[PDB]
Structure formats: C-alpha cells, structure tokens
Design an enzyme around this catalytic site. Structure first.
Site, PDB file in Angstrom:
ATOM      1  N   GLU A 158      49.264  33.068  32.924  1.00 58.17           N
ATOM      2  CA  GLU A 158      49.687  32.600  34.337  1.00 58.17           C
ATOM      3  C   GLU A 158      50.991  31.889  33.873  1.00 58.17           C
ATOM      4  O   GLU A 158      51.328  31.284  34.743  1.00 58.17           O
ATOM      5  CB  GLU A 158      48.616  32.165  34.732  1.00 58.17           C
ATOM      6  CG  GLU A 158      47.186  33.419  35.266  1.00 58.17           C
ATOM      7  CD  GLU A 158      46.271  31.968  36.147  1.00 58.17           C
ATOM      8  OE1 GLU A 158      46.818  30.924  35.685  1.00 58.17           O
ATOM      9  OE2 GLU A 158      45.153  33.028  36.244  1.00 58.17           O
ATOM     10  N   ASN A 184      49.220  37.797  29.762  1.00 64.55           N
ATOM     11  CA  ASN A 184      48.320  37.978  31.358  1.00 64.55           C
ATOM     12  C   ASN A 184      48.549  37.552  32.247  1.00 64.55           C
ATOM     13  O   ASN A 184      49.177  35.522  31.978  1.00 64.55           O
ATOM     14  CB  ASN A 184      47.077  37.081  30.517  1.00 64.55           C
ATOM     15  CG  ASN A 184      45.990  37.888  31.643  1.00 64.55           C
ATOM     16  OD1 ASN A 184      45.226  38.908  31.039  1.00 64.55           O
ATOM     17  ND2 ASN A 184      44.767  36.983  31.827  1.00 64.55           N
ATOM     18  N   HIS A 226      42.259  41.344  39.745  1.00 66.53           N
ATOM     19  CA  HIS A 226      41.506  39.702  40.811  1.00 66.53           C
ATOM     20  C   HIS A 226      41.761  40.338  42.293  1.00 66.53           C
ATOM     21  O   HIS A 226      42.934  39.501  42.811  1.00 66.53           O
ATOM     22  CB  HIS A 226      41.497  38.411  40.538  1.00 66.53           C
ATOM     23  CG  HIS A 226      41.307  37.856  39.985  1.00 66.53           C
ATOM     24  ND1 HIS A 226      40.031  37.407  39.471  1.00 66.53           N
ATOM     25  CD2 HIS A 226      41.515  36.924  38.170  1.00 66.53           C
ATOM     26  CE1 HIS A 226      39.606  36.794  38.177  1.00 66.53           C
ATOM     27  NE2 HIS A 226      40.937  36.625  37.808  1.00 66.53           N
ATOM     28  N   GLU A 281      40.373  40.596  34.348  1.00 68.60           N
ATOM     29  CA  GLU A 281      39.465  39.339  35.070  1.00 68.60           C
ATOM     30  C   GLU A 281      38.929  40.849  35.940  1.00 68.60           C
ATOM     31  O   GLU A 281      39.434  40.041  37.123  1.00 68.60           O
ATOM     32  CB  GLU A 281      40.220  38.514  34.728  1.00 68.60           C
ATOM     33  CG  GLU A 281      41.147  37.704  33.833  1.00 68.60           C
ATOM     34  CD  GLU A 281      41.085  36.624  33.928  1.00 68.60           C
ATOM     35  OE1 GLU A 281      41.171  35.552  35.312  1.00 68.60           O
ATOM     36  OE2 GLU A 281      42.244  35.822  32.925  1.00 68.60           O
ATOM     37  N   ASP A 303      37.622  41.894  39.420  1.00 69.90           N
ATOM     38  CA  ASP A 303      36.820  41.200  40.206  1.00 69.90           C
ATOM     39  C   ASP A 303      37.374  42.470  42.067  1.00 69.90           C
ATOM     40  O   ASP A 303      38.904  41.811  41.865  1.00 69.90           O
ATOM     41  CB  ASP A 303      35.943  40.386  40.427  1.00 69.90           C
ATOM     42  CG  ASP A 303      36.802  38.840  40.371  1.00 69.90           C
ATOM     43  OD1 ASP A 303      38.204  39.057  40.322  1.00 69.90           O
ATOM     44  OD2 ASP A 303      36.727  38.585  39.754  1.00 69.90           O
TER      45      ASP A 303
END
Ligand SMILES: [Zn+2]
Ligand SMILES: [Zn+2]
Ligand SMILES: [Zn+2]
Ligand SMILES: [Zn+2]
Ligand SMILES: [Zn+2]
Ligand SMILES: [Zn+2]
Ligand SMILES: [Zn+2]
Length: 313
Positions: free
Chosen positions: A128, A169, A205, A233, A235
């Site tokens: 990030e 990432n 995400h 990651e 979801d």
C-alpha cells in the site's frame, strides 16, 4: 473423487489459498478445512514488522514460524506478508533518525527475507504505497527516505533471497484507474531501470455488485509488462444483512474474478483473506458490511463457493 478449490486451481497451473492467523489455529473445524481445501497459505499478521522486529535490531520469527510449519505440514506453499508497510509498524520505527531509516529498512528486510529463504514462493515486499489518486502515500518511509524507498526495498529483498518472487501489493488497483495507473508506471519504470520486481499483488478487497469491468484488461496489461499477477487478499463484501439476492450477486462476482485470472496466463493464483465469515476482518473495518467470504460463519459453503469451483472448471 470431488476436487477441492486448491486441486482445481493446481490442475490449471495456479494455486488457490487462504490467509490465516495464529489465534485461529485452536479452531479444529477451521484448521481442518484450511489444510485440505487450499494449496497455499498467507500469514495474516505474524510476519509483519510489529511482530518480527518489536525492538530495534531484535528479531522474532516464532509466531510466523508456526504458520509456515503448518502450511508445510499440509504441503501448501506460503506467501510472505509483508516487509514494508505503514501499518502494524512498531513505535520505535517512527523515532529512527530520518538519515538512518533507509539502513534500518534494508536491515529489517535482510534479516526476515534471509530467515525464510527457500520456504516461500513470494514476498509482498512493499504494501500500500499509493493513495487513491495515484500520489505516494506519505508514510514514514516516503517522508524520510523519499521516492526511492520502494526500489531500495526490492533491491534489499532480492539480495537476501534471489529465488523468491518479489511482489508489490496494494488494494483498489483491480480496475484501470488513477491508482493502478501509478502502480503500472512504477513497475514499468522498475523494469526499465533494472530494479528487481517479479509481480503485482492485487489485494482485491471488492464490493459485491461493484467488480471493476476492466479487471481482465488490467491484469493483462501488467502481465504484458513482464511481471506475474496475483489476487492476494480476495473478499467481496456486501451490506448486511445477507439475502438470497445478495449471495447470488456475490457468487457471480467471485466467478467473474476467478475467470478473469484464468484468462491471463501470468495470473499465478488467488488467495482469499481467510475463507470463513467467522474470522473475516471486514465487519471491524467496514461498518455495516460483511459476509464477504465463500464459507459462512457456520462453515457452510455459500453459492460463492459453487461459482468459484465452476470457474476453476
Ligand atoms: Zn480429495
Ligand atoms: Zn483469519
Ligand atoms: Zn516471541
Ligand atoms: Zn519450524
Ligand atoms: Zn489510465
Ligand atoms: Zn449459514
Ligand atoms: Zn453447488
């Protein structure tokens, strides 16, 4: 037989894994599914700076070691996560004199990467680093070291373990836009300058019903730069409470996301940020949202599971 998500993915040269955390290991039902359904594991927290170097120059890999051991016990690959990040950073880092931070960052990276050498397939080297508009996040590393910190982090990681894949990432970089553009330019710049980097991790995400239509094109353009891509990651959160319609939309989204990755040969795999709503981080961070994973709180497979398995074919 009846293949697992992991087996279905591996059948197509990819992995399908799940993140996990130490506090969850006592849950027998949870670890049973974790060890059999997936082919890859990502430690959720214990490989982060706050745990691995709680005090300057003193390292501690015991907690992370447990997750790695568990993964190896089940024949699952492991992704290291994460070396440099503005969150979950012990307080002593902010006190390091600006002129010494680069040396400290390199040292932290050198020790942790070297410690796990030969046991991980990837490392999320920097996490990030960008704001939503594409500008640099003003973390302690950006402010005190400058723009070169990301590049330096990757150089240090490569130096400590030449075989592991080095990943950048970040979240909200799944669709083509200001943020992913910035990452795209950075990767392009790195490749031209000889800065080591092997892949881009799209945390993915996502929000139910709002999956970026340009996902596939975005994954491919990164692949065309000469780097692998991974959904790290995954979801897909929805506004609670869930309903048959919401579960169905979520299933369609999971299916679309998986097929987008299977279309690009360099999209090496997918990792959900844990697999059951029982332990999802979503509710605590996104008020009013949840039920973002393929298994619900009672470990029942949702329609989303059906879509993923179908997509993996
Ligand atoms: Zn089986
Ligand atoms: Zn978890
Ligand atoms: Zn300890
Ligand atoms: Zn061990
Ligand atoms: Zn653009
Ligand atoms: Zn249920
Ligand atoms: Zn089904």
């Amino acid at each position: 037989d009846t293949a697992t998500l992991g087996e279905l993915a591996e059948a197509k040269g990819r992995y399908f894994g799940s993140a996990t955390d130490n506090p969850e290991l006592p849950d027998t039902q949870y670890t049973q599914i974790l060890g059999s359904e997936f082919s890859q594991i990502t430690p959720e927290n214990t490989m982060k700076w706050q745990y691995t170097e709680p005090s300057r120059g003193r390292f501690d890999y015991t907690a992370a070691e447990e997750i790695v051991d568990l993964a190896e016990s089940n024949g699952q690959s492991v992704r290291g996560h994460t070396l440099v990040w503005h969150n979950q950073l012990p307080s002593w880092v902010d006190d390091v004199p600006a002129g010494e931070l680069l040396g400290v960052m390199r040292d932290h990276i050198t020790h942790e990467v070297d410690h796990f050498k030969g046991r991980l397939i990837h490392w999320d080297v920097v996490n990030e680093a960008f704001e939503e508009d594409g500008s640099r996040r003003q973390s302690v590393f950006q402010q005190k070291i400058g723009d070169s910190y990301i590049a330096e982090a990757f150089k240090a990681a490569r130096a400590a373990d030449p075989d592991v894949k080095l990943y950048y990432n970040d979240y909200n970089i799944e669709g083509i836009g200001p943020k992913s553009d910035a990452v795209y330019e950075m990767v392009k710049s790195f490749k031209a300058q000889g800065i080591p980097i092997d892949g881009v991790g799209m945390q993915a995400h996502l929000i139910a019903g709002q999956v970026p239509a340009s996902l596939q094109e975005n994954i491919r353009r990164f692949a065309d730069l000469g780097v692998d891509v991974a959904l790290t990651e995954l979801d897909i959160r929805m506004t609670l409470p869930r309903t048959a319609a919401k579960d169905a939309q979520q299933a369609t989204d999971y299916g679309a996301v998986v097929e987008a990755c299977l279309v690009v040969s360099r999209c090496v795999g997918i990792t959900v940020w844990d697999y059951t709503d029982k332990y999802s981080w979503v509710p605590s961070v996104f008020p009013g949202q949840g039920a973002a994973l393929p298994w619900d709180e009672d470990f029942a497979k949702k329609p989303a599971y059906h879509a993923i398995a179908a997509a993996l074919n």
